Design a protein around this ligand. Structure first.
Ligand SMILES: Nc1nc2c(ncn2[C@H]2C[C@H](O)[C@@H](COP(=O)(O)OP(=O)(O)OP(=O)(O)O)O2)c(=O)[nH]1
Ligand SMILES: Nc1nc2c(ncn2[C@H]2C[C@H](O)[C@@H](COP(=O)(O)OP(=O)(O)OP(=O)(O)O)O2)c(=O)[nH]1
Ligand SMILES: [Mg+2]
Ligand SMILES: [Mg+2]
Lengths: 664, 664
């Protein structure tokens, strides 16, 4: 509350003032236990700072360090700001400026403009960027989609090294394994039989612990993807279970499903489902939709697998999701039908947070780089006070900058494995998202489930896409289209909402944009992929993501600001009020004396029907180039209740059906 | 007892008679679950059999299948003989003949001579050979000494793949890790710190389970080597412990010590010992003896490590050996001082059974191929009955054949990893050994601890070395010396006993041999390395190794044959006799009515002082080109009792001080 004006002002006492001087300390730094030079800025950047020392130190408006809250800033403090001898050397306005340089190089113009927006909290970059930008070998990329190289030991161990090598800097991982022969399959080279998928998981799990993000930082985090027609499926969904045969689990990895529609059909038609080893049914994961059912269906009839009740596996699945909140569900066909990267071949997985959908292959590791726009920062008191409005014009302007920013990162990024440099330089996927969605709605006195909010959600995401395409367009005008652009849905003028079959909302001239794209190309294969934003929404102080509030009272106990103020204005904020939020989860519902309109504005995500949540997710998805991390929350979860969340969303044509499942 | 004349004769009913016909069944074989051709003979051999069908089927004397005992043969049955549909297709005389071809090619002369000796039980080959010889991709090699490629993730994971790739056919492994930076050391690339050696062990342990020798056969088996000056040493010795912090053990690997003399000195002088990370003290394992102490000593004084009491670590060690029977102790200097491969660089480890000492490096994986001569088979009733003798003339003749055999294997072997083909083709190490040593002594009415037995042990091993060198010499006459011969102790005329500083015993003309070696070279870098022989001594029916009997009564309960007969001749074999062997471990000592000379002949290895055992080990070692697997057995093990076994043997200049430690 007050210890934010106080712990911020304390580090202002115990830290150097001039920027160029902080760079100097970092650049010159030497590990004392080893007498070894351990610089924390790169040559390229160090130089830049020096040759503009005056222009740069006089940019940094230091009164801007007071835009961060209590835990906003103590998060920047504990893990983000660069550290001399356990002592913090970087002020928050120093991390920003360094990030801006780390991104912009000799374009000190772009640098300064990027510095201003980050300091006035218009937007921010994902954690890898904030940590590493402007430093010796800058690894600014959050996520990696990796292919299992081949159904062999060589392939397996080659993929296992790669995962270590990636895990050792720090990037999540999405690995897919559709091709590993299942328990029992023959091996020609040793007249032997396979123990299947689980022991293989176990090795990876293991490397995931050993390679603790560059030694002593964070233990690795892997998402693994399968298609539910793989014969090891029952054991694969159970990987995070709490009970028995320890030798058969793998508690530090996340199972995700790559779900073909056929599967969903079978389940609702209460029919059969057939399980295969990839060696008996080759090719199932190198095609989708119709061509897939044609081929799946034939393999089937040919006696090639083991059939059970489609519904047996489904029950298995819901059982696991209820207990672990996993596996995730990403819809394979939905993904491939509506991806701008379809000319590349069949996309085989998503990432760790289920927002990225990008082509991956043995020699191509899909990479993506994220930033998030701060939705609340564009709200303004109207043109006659006593009333508020949203500035879509600025938002558009802003998304353009972040779009350009995310490009430079592609060029100035340091790549852990050659597969990822090959991948990223060819297709250039970028990933924008949002935060403060629930805050924006709140500020505007629009409940999350209203028709105004529903409308707002649509138009916010419209301008963000339209902008991120406009600017990807200008860049292709300057630097050429991405190399793999010829052939894409985009090159024909098919944009994201076109392939969902909808007219756009229309707040922006889509006809003109498409004309230019068709004409000159765009720089990026992809652009929009709203992410969890867990770490960075904390720092800016917004509710993460697009999810609504889980609670109006967090934990040290902090009550939702926007509500807090409302209560005291309505002269009802005493102690009885504080105490009916403490044990009762922070739900202002059914509460002795609180106006029905506040009750409508301050709903906990458990009080929003998951039918409404899905709808809005389905609405913004028309402008989402990739997918998005859709978490689901039920209180009293019956088997059927889950069953209609999955089916509803699938029938909505969602790419990501479910990320997590938070329960109870 | 009788069910060996009965279970052997039963498979004679349920198996094809003609050899060429069995080859045919194998060669043509098709896995029914996959409709895939799975031949069990190679093209090369299949052809050979066909084009000599008549000469070959009429070689096989089938009355020779009755030379195997009860569990001798049911061991050949359960795991050795090739199997059609879980049905056995190969007779024992078929496995032999196939092995002989698998080895000898178009030299059908050598083939037939090799077939005869194997069937009359003159000698045999190690398990990889018996299994694989003459089959599609013949992997005939028991052991692999592997180098940790480099102190990096790339290096670590590159070594981990290699180990999988090796483990997947089936060869033990000796890996050494002297160079991996220890807990806490700095990492430049991620401004981080190392969790050290244990988690690294844990990954390897893991790959060792996953890669179950070609899928569904045997779980992998790794020996790991360290020098006790490595800072993770206390945790490394404890790897097989039975108690706490599960996250800190690794129960499926074997710790072994590469022990520098300095360490032993410090311990007996009750002085200091200093622990280093290889990154603080680089080079300790790329030198030995004096140059090492010079360098170790300096690093020390320079403040580079952490000193404790030499004796602290020693106590740690004996504590672990008492409880687990591990780590093994191989003496580094002893090994390098007296190796014919010293011109190659510094040998850094032994194998899994502690008998191999061969040069290894990141790109060179040391390989060795074993066989074992059947010591009893050369005993003969003298030249006037009523008395026995040993035919050293035949033994010599025989060791020559096995020597030639072991060569062809080098050329016809299929190599799992390129490192091992490079290694083996350059240096050509071969490994002969023995079995039936305790049987030989018994047959001859010479107690294991006598002066006659002591003499016999010396001369047996003399002729075996002299022969294996003579024939390696003739081969260098035919095919050229091994490529790395120029420079060796051998090229100068320095033979194995010379570098122990002893005159040979003299039963064979050593002057003439050395003349030829100096003149023409020898084919092999090394030749003699007596092994555990566990699996194959079972089959031929001899007591394994050179170790004496552990028991006169095994388990179905079988009593030592040579004793059994003695008792019934001495008219004292009733039931009371049987019953004073059952619970009382099979020790005929201090027993109501059994002649003191039998008591002297039928000693259990626990009743032989380990001082005697060491002496004989020290005696034969002068003719052992490599080292040998020296197991130790104590009943009432005090700390000091162990301490003088280690020190005694070290001062004896033994290379392998201790393999296992069987206790209680
Ligand atoms: N659990 C276990 N799995 C194995 C082992 N060896 C191979 N595999 C599994 C993993 C791979 O997905 C599959 C194929 O391995 P490879 O391609 O190295 O087998 P190879 O080329 O000898 O035989 P193939 O012709 O592919 O059947 O076999 C083993 O020793 N243990
Ligand atoms: N536990 C753990 N150990 C690591 C990690 N990254 C590296 N290591 C250890 C294993 C290696 O023996 C040692 C060196 O690894 P590298 O050569 O790949 O480190 P790099 O080249 O970045 O730094 P260097 O210049 O060698 O300190 O660091 C990690 O994320 N976790
Ligand atoms: Mg294969
Ligand atoms: Mg390195």
């Amino acid at each position: 509350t007050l210890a934010a004006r106080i712990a911020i002002s304390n580090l202002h006492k115990q830290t150097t003032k001039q920027f160029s001087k902080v760079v100097e300390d970092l650049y010159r730094y030497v590990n004392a236990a080893t007498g070894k030079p351990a610089p924390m800025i790169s040559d390229d950047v160090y130089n830049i700072v020096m040759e503009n020392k005056d222009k740069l130190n006089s940019a940094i408006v230091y009164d801007r360090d007071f835009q961060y809250s209590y835990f906003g800033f103590k998060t920047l403090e504990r893990s983000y700001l660069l550290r001399i001898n356990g002592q913090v050397a970087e002020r928050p306005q120093h991390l920003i400026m360094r990030v801006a340089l780390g991104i912009h190089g000799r374009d000190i113009e772009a640098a300064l403009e990027t510095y201003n927006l980050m300091s006035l909290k218009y937007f921010t970059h994902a954690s890898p960027t904030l940590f590493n930008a402007g430093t010796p070998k800058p690894q600014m990329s959050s996520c990696f989609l990796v292919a299992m190289k081949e159904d062999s030991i060589e392939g397996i161990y080659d993929t296992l090294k790669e995962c270590a090598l990636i895990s050792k800097t720090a990037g999540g991982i999405g690995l897919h394994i559709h091709n590993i022969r299942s328990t029992g399959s023959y091996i020609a080279g040793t007249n032997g039989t396979s123990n299947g998928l689980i022991p293989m998981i176990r090795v990876f799990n293991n490397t995931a612990r050993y390679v603790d993000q560059g030694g002593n930082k964070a233990p690795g985090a892997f998402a693994l993807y399968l298609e539910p027609w793989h014969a090891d499926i029952f054991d694969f969904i159970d990987i995070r279970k709490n009970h028995g045969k320890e030798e058969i689990r793998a508690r530090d990895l996340f199972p995700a499903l790559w779900i073909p529609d056929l599967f969903m059909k079978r389940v609702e038609e209460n029919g059969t489902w057939t399980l295969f080893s990839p060696t008996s049914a080759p090719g199932l994961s190198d095609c989708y939709g119709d061509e897939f059912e044609a081929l799946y269906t034939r393999y089937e009839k040919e006696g090639r697998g083991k059939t059970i009740k489609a519904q047996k596996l489904w029950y298995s699945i819901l059982e696991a999701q209820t207990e672990t909140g996993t596996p995730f569900v990403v819809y394979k066909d939905a993904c491939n039908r509506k991806s701008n990267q379809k000319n590349l071949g069949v996309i085989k997985s998503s990432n760790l947070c289920c927002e990225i959908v990008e082509y991956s292959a043995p020699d191509e590791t899909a990479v993506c780089n994220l930033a998030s726009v701060a939705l609340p920062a564009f709200i303004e008191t109207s043109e006659d006070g006593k009333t508020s409005t949203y500035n879509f014009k600025k938002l558009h302007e802003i998304a353009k900058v972040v779009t350009r920013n995310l490009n430079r990162v592609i060029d100035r990024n340091y790549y852990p494995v050659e597969e990822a440099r090959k991948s990223n330089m060819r297709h250039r996927p970028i990933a924008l998202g949002v935060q403060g969605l629930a805050d924006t709605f709140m500020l505007l006195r629009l409940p999350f489930d209203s028709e105004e909010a529903r409308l707002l959600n649509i138009q916010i995401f419209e301008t963000i896409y339209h902008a991120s395409m406009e600017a990807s367009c200008e860049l292709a005008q300057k630097d050429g289209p991405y190399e793999t652009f010829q052939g894409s849905p985009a090159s024909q003028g098919i944009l994201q909402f076109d392939m969902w079959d909808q007219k756009p909302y229309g707040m922006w001239d889509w006809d003109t944009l498409r004309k230019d794209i068709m004409k000159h190309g765009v720089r990026n294969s992809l652009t929009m992929a709203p992410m969890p934003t867990a770490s960075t929404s904390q720092i800016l102080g917004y509710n993460e993501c697009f999810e609504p509030v889980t609670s109006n009272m967090y934990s040290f106990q902090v009550v939702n600001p926007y509500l807090l103020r409302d209560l005291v204005d309505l002269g009802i904020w005493d102690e009885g009020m504080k105490q009916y939020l403490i044990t009762q989860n922070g739900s202002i519902q059914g509460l002795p004396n609180v106006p029905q309109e506040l009750k409508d504005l301050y709903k906990t995500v458990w009080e929003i029907s998951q039918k409404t949540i899905i709808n809005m997710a389905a609405d913004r998805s028309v402008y989402i180039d990739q997918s998005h991390s859709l978490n689901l929350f039920l209180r009293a979860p019956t088997m059927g209740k889950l069953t209609s969340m999955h089916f509803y969303g699938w029938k909505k044509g969602l790419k990501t059906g479910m990320y997590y499942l938070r329960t109870q």
